[PDB]
Design an enzyme around this catalytic site. Sequence first.
Site, mmCIF file in Angstrom:
data_model
loop_
_atom_site.group_PDB
_atom_site.id
_atom_site.type_symbol
_atom_site.label_atom_id
_atom_site.label_comp_id
_atom_site.label_asym_id
_atom_site.label_seq_id
_atom_site.Cartn_x
_atom_site.Cartn_y
_atom_site.Cartn_z
ATOM 1 N N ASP A 1 0.826 -1.200 0.000
ATOM 2 C CA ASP A 1 0.000 0.000 0.000
ATOM 3 C C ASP A 1 0.864 1.255 0.000
ATOM 4 O O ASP A 1 1.847 1.357 0.739
ATOM 5 C CB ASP A 1 -0.927 -0.002 1.216
ATOM 6 C CG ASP A 1 -1.987 -1.083 1.137
ATOM 7 O OD1 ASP A 1 -2.211 -1.621 0.032
ATOM 8 O OD2 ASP A 1 -2.595 -1.398 2.182
ATOM 9 N N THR B 1 -4.805 1.155 -3.288
ATOM 10 C CA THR B 1 -4.704 2.609 -3.317
ATOM 11 C C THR B 1 -3.594 3.107 -4.232
ATOM 12 O O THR B 1 -3.483 4.321 -4.435
ATOM 13 C CB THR B 1 -4.481 3.150 -1.903
ATOM 14 O OG1 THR B 1 -3.277 2.593 -1.362
ATOM 15 C CG2 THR B 1 -5.651 2.783 -1.003
ATOM 16 N N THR B 2 -2.771 2.207 -4.779
ATOM 17 C CA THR B 2 -1.702 2.629 -5.678
ATOM 18 C C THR B 2 -2.265 3.270 -6.941
ATOM 19 O O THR B 2 -1.744 4.286 -7.416
ATOM 20 C CB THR B 2 -0.814 1.436 -6.031
ATOM 21 O OG1 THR B 2 -0.229 0.904 -4.836
ATOM 22 C CG2 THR B 2 0.294 1.855 -6.986
ATOM 23 N N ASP C 1 -9.045 -4.342 6.005
ATOM 24 C CA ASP C 1 -9.749 -3.691 4.907
ATOM 25 C C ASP C 1 -10.847 -4.575 4.329
ATOM 26 O O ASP C 1 -11.858 -4.057 3.841
ATOM 27 C CB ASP C 1 -8.761 -3.298 3.808
ATOM 28 C CG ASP C 1 -7.834 -2.176 4.233
ATOM 29 O OD1 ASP C 1 -8.143 -1.495 5.235
ATOM 30 O OD2 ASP C 1 -6.797 -1.977 3.569
#
Lengths: 507, 522, 513, 506
Positions: D45, D78-79, D372
């Site tokens: 992440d 999220t990259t 998550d």
Amino acid sequence: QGKGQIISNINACVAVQEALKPTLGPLGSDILIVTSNQKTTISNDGATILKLLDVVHPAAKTLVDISRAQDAEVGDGTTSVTILAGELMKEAKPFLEEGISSHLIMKGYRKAVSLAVEKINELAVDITSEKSSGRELLERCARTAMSSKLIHNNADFFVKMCVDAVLSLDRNDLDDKLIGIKKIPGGAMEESLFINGVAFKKTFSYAGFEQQPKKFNNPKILSLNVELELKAEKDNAEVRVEHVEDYQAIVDAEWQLIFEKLRQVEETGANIVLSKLPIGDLATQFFADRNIFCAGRVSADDMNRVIQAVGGSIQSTTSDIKPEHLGTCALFEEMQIGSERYNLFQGCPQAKTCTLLLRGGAEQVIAEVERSLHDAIMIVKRALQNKLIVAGGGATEMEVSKCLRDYSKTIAGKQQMIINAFAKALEVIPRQLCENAGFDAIEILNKLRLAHSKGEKWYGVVFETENIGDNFAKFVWEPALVKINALNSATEATNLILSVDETITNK
Amino acid sequence: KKRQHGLEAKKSHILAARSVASIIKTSLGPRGLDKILISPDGEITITNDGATILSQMELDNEIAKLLVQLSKSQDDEIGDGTTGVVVLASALLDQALELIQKGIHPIKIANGFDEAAKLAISKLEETCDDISASNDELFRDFLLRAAKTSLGSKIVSKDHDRFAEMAVEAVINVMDKDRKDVDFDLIKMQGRVGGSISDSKLINGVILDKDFSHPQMPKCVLPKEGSDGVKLAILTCPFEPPKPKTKHKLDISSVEEYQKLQTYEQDKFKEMIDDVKKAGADVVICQWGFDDEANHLLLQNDLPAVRWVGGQELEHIAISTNGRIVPRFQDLSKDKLGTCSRIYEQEFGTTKDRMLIIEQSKETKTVTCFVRGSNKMIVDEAERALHDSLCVVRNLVKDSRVVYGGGAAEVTMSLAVSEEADKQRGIDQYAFRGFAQALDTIPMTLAENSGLDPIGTLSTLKSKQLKEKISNIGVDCLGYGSNDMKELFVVDPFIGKKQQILLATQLCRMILKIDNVIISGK
Amino acid sequence: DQVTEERAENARLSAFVGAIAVGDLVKSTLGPKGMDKLLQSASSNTCMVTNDGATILKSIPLDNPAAKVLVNISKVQDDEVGDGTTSVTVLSAELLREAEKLIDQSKIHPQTIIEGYRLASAAALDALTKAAVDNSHDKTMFREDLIHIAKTTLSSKILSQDKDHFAELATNAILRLKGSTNLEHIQIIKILGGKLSDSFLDEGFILAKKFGNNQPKRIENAKILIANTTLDTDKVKIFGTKFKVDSTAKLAQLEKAEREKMKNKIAKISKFGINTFINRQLIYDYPEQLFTDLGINSIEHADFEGVERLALVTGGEVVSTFDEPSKCKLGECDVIEEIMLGEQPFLKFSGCKAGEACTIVLRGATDQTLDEAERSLHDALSVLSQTTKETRTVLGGGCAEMVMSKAVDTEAQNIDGKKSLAVEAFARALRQLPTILADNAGFDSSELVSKLRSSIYNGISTSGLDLNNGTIADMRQLGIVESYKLKRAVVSSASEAAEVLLRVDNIIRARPR
Amino acid sequence: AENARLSAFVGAIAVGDLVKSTLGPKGMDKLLQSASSNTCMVTNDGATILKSIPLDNPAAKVLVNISKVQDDEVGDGTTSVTVLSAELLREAEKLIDQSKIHPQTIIEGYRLASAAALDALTKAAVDNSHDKTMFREDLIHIAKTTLSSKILSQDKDHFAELATNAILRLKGSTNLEHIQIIKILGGKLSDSFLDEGFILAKKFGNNQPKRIENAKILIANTTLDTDKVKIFGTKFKVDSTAKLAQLEKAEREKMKNKIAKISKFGINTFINRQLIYDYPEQLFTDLGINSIEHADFEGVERLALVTGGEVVSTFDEPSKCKLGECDVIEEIMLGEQPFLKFSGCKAGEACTIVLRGATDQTLDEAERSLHDALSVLSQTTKETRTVLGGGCAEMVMSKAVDTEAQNIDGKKSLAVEAFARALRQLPTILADNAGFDSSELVSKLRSSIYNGISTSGLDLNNGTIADMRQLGIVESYKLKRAVVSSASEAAEVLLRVDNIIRARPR
């Protein structure tokens, strides 16, 4: 100063001793050394290694001075002289801790060498008779040296061509200057040619290159030092002139002086005309119409070899040439290898010398090849005056090593230990062989004690089969007479280094 | 000075050139890439040649001299396909690193290579073809098939048809009708920067940078009234008003003696032009300069001349015109006159310097390929590429055997050495297989730059050559699909792969024997 | 030691940015609307302001080898076009930039990218050959089309607004040469001062020298002689001679013999029957007065370049070895008089015997325009001379690059495969060349170029971009046309040079000495 | 435009190229080596990556704040948030400079594209709701989409049954503090156990029994350390040590009276926040009550949710408040250190998942995966709409963006099409890590959706186009809307920078 100065002189020889460990034996490796001439020397024998080695400490020059003495004496396997002398100094470290003087050490090693001179004559045997002789004995002795350095696999073809070149040497003369050869770069590593006379490379180019005939059936050799070119006179060319027409006469006189000498070169009719000095392009187009071989910029050494071959001479005057100054040979065939033409003199009136034409781009290969020929003439010289040989592989010193232990055991007390250290120092020769061969030195040296006592004498060490066997019956032999001067020279050098307690360096 | 013993100088010394030789590995084959090398003087030379880069490259370890020393002999021996051969020269030292870890003695590693080298050559002699068994017409057809794969290597390979007729017609002029001869010495290629690369033609002769002086006449006269080769001539002695070169003094005792010195040169000005005009030689080359007063009379008598011509080019002119350069003014004669078919000066650019071109339309000893190109960097690269073609034909002359190229040779001898290794057994079974294993890296490296599976192609080669003994199946360099080299006209000289692999094997024998490295300053 | 080597990771990025960084200076120099640049030299504190990168990029030190070959190939452009040749480096920089984005997206091997440019260059040669128009069949339209060819090639310098005044210069001058491609025949002289439009084309020769003392400034019906003989320095010898004398009596006789040397030399000159004499070197005072006594003009200090231009323009011949008076030829001019051009008065010639060459008088406002007009006239008539040889022409001005894009796009459909990406990249990079040209004039490079792109695909060849009004106008109406020989060498050499730069996987920097 | 924005474009792309290898399930993890403390961390992440990396470009630091938004909301994948914004900066280098268009107009083109992107995400959403039978069974395959982006994917099928039963025990709990994740060194990922209860890493006393059935657990915030702390500023005034020795000893009996109040509760287990002196510890042995101490803050809080009890400070009333009960509290030793295993909780108020791994870097990083994943399960329960991922969602939006470009036309279509081309580069970068052909896979996916097939997608395992419903690739609408809407507005601020002001360093 003191005992520490002697160790400092010995430690200077250790750096040379540790570098020469791979340099002994057929299975010994090679060392890379760079010199100031930009010549990288990769070699087996330590003959030329000690000459090109950079000396740091002043005491290290002692091994270099004795190397040149054994260089012209033996030349092959002389790297073991400094190794054995280094072991005598290395094993002297526990002796320096005691109160034993170097002179007591001098008498210890001298009595072992004084007997060793007698043992070598006893350990060997006169061969002669119908046994190995010329074309046979010469091949067995030359194969040991040569095949132990380079061209390991192809030595069957390579050494056979070199042994056949030494066969031209005959007794009753035995000239030592016959070993002169030349270096031919380029070509295949496995290809080599045989030439019985002087060969010299062009080294220059001129417009009549491709018009130069390469084959003469019956040439005539003539040596002249006259340089062909337009240049000022010897001392002073100043000429006082009045009339104007005489200045063009000077231009004609400068031409007539050269042009008349150019006609005298073609007037002789010799099919071989060699100039000791360079040759310019002024005489090219003229002399080329005559279609006679010519070579300029010839070295003075090559010109002297022709004088010693066909019996010619160098003269600066053409009208003074005597009838015997024109030599003749059997055949002249000019060979071109790699766009480089080479002259060939075949069938000289008296030629005992054979110039080997090598090939390949590596310059360090001929170093041992010239050294192998330097050893080949030593084999011929030492096979005539005294006829005898010993076994090969380097196990000869181990036979006399135990003989010194038996005699000196009962001889005068403390002198046993000093001589026993010498016999222990003789074990370094098979020790360095077992290290480079991946063998076990403990098991082999223990079997040699029985092989040199209950195993009679001639049994050596065989590297090929990884076993112990007789090299004398194997027909692979090593020159016996080269070890006489090799063992005695290392003793006087070791006794000199151990006798120096101080070193003086000015500035 | 540093102290290195044991595996320090027995491994990193070999690992040094291993990382250096891996640099040019990307340049292997026509799929390779170029490189930039800045000279110590500040100039920049851009080429992919393995021999050109390593020659001018300054390295640290002394092993670089061992790689350059080999390339010196390769140029005089083979020197064919240098970009292809230079990669496999260092492939023999990479496999030796694995045998050292296994416990094999270094000399046993070197001696094991020469044992399997003689057996690998005998296997290659099975599939070789004889080109000399055909006639001269089929031989030239074999040259056209070879010039596609062999000649074209480096850049400008875009259009290979322009230089195809250049290399073929070059060896036709100088050759023997029995097809045994070679001369690469009289063939010199002098190119210029201009026009396009497709403008290259075949012009036999030399290209002189110096034009006709005294721009008071025509740049070129194509025909000649006397015919017979325009009567080319070259004066060896410098052209000057005659005076003693040695030290001398003049004594003038009267005005008449000073006036005779005035008519001195005046009589020699007419004497030098009449001796040349009597012979009728149109082309007269003066090596060092000429006289200013004679700069006119040459045009007055119609005698084109040049100044400051190098002695190297003068040797190619006399052999091409079958004449002899005049050593002395008194030796001038019509018997030394040469033969020149046509001579003219190329327009080149707008002004620049007009290049004098001597051309012989008939058979001549000096063969030259007319070369022009837009890029200046490709000049030296394209010339040396065609300079190796002179030795390519030489390999087909001296050696009549030709083998199918494309890396199929090393795969063919790989199965033979693998079978011959089982006969000796002992510790040499892995040593002989290691020698063939190093040769197996050549096919895997060819497919690396092309983006093809190295093993997937190699596995098909040995599988296909097992059923059929024909060697026409080989690695595909350019992505031609099917691996048959017979339809693609891919052939390599037999003596080319022979010596280059053998001489590399003979050299690596002494390289692996290095233990200690001693370096001393010059 | 101290050898910095970059692998394929660093060398691939460093080689592409090298040509883009320095290439940004020559992007604004494209076309007549292009701008100029300034360079500050550390030596002599000089500068050169021009739009031609041959004298710009050569004096700019750069450590990137990628642009080193671009400077060497500029001499080939200097031997062909010479004006606006910066597009070779701009197009090559675009090919390097598009290939940099092509390898970051398609990720194909760089050798495959080069193979695409090889097939794309073949389609570009077909579009230029089929669109080639040869008007040389009609001599009336041929001489009129030379003006249209001139208007395209003669707009480079800031003075291009004077092209209407300068168009008549190159129009009549190319007709006087009649096949002379050499600049040594063309006489180009620089004059400081006067209006920018004062440049005119005169028939004759203009000499910047003068007459020494008594030579009349106006000579009519004179025989011009050119001699390389030595006058000013006289006795200078260079023999092996030395001087020894008993008394000063014979010492003066040597100077008397010097007079007899010149008296006998002028006697051979007097046999020529010339009213004008020219020497390569200076003239000594004694023969200078002899020229005025016999009524012979004197001209001295003619260098190696000027001694030829005298005989080349006037059709004469340089004469040496006076012993042959009747074996040579003598130049002749109708009116030889001294005029005044600017501050320095010049010697004017009129009525030359041979009209093979002409003299172009150049007068300008500033010294910066002297070398600027020299670069514009470096290739002027030679460009028109190459059109005399190769008479096939094609409409230029940015439209020809768009016509080739239609041929590349058509060939890209027959190729397809994965090699068409490099073929299409060449078409996309080629269409960006006129886009940068529209950026130089500050006009719209988006809507106008988009309309020009669809106009070529609609089958209109004559459609082009108008530089003055910034709209779509036909090149035949504006008169913008270029020869087939010039444009073929620009597009081909730009693609051939780009193939080498994409092949660099390594950059080796040796330690400086 | 030139000197105004220079490092804002290429500098932001160079940052995204470093994390380019981290994007996708076939991507790899980057090593973060800190120059201080000589520590290291391995994380996929970009929340931790972009935080610890020095950033000279102020625009790159802005990408950290937008990463923290997707870190809390999503946290996985999220990259692609910062990478998508980097492609918008690359297209802005041309349209603003080359095409010569004002930056606000390029922003306005993205503003109208952002409104059209929201319409494509809502209409393409699939509604999975109502009956929880097929819904919970689909959560097994839906979770596997975003479950493992790491090299640890071998644990997918194993953790799929554990993550599904985790929310089953919560019974609708949306608080992430109700779940307990235990990180244990050694073992394999397939050795993870899931039981009903809680496992504490502490131990019992010396004489405390190892097995107690039907134990009543009670915690508290008090401090048993020693004596009584009373108030501030106290002291002892006595005549001699006779009274002083009694005051110290009597308070040990006074604390026993408080322990006597504990015995009135009848609890079999006691838990204290702070340390406990030996004397009150031995009093718990006489009553047969376990003791737990050394809980800073969350130690007593995590156990209160599992047992469902309440902190009792006063110990006054054995009636009100709460009494928790566990069936079997027996101490179970796992690995090296002994652990306290609780079972048979009074209710399903909380749950505990035990994880085991050989590498310590795997425990910390995989903790964010299940943390998550449970957030996604809570969003699928709230938000009833889901979409399809795997490269297909970017091509579906490209169809709507290209459709809107035909209606707007003009010169803004260059900015609208560039937004679609930026959406085309994301699956190219997504498939760049797998090492397959971009032109082959994108052309088959892009053209298939224009033909009316929305079920296709990029398959990086087999290197072809496969159905995302069969492979089990499903993304919820809450995850897809949060990434697209934030990334579209992330580059909107970066394109508003007309100048760079560098303050003097301190």
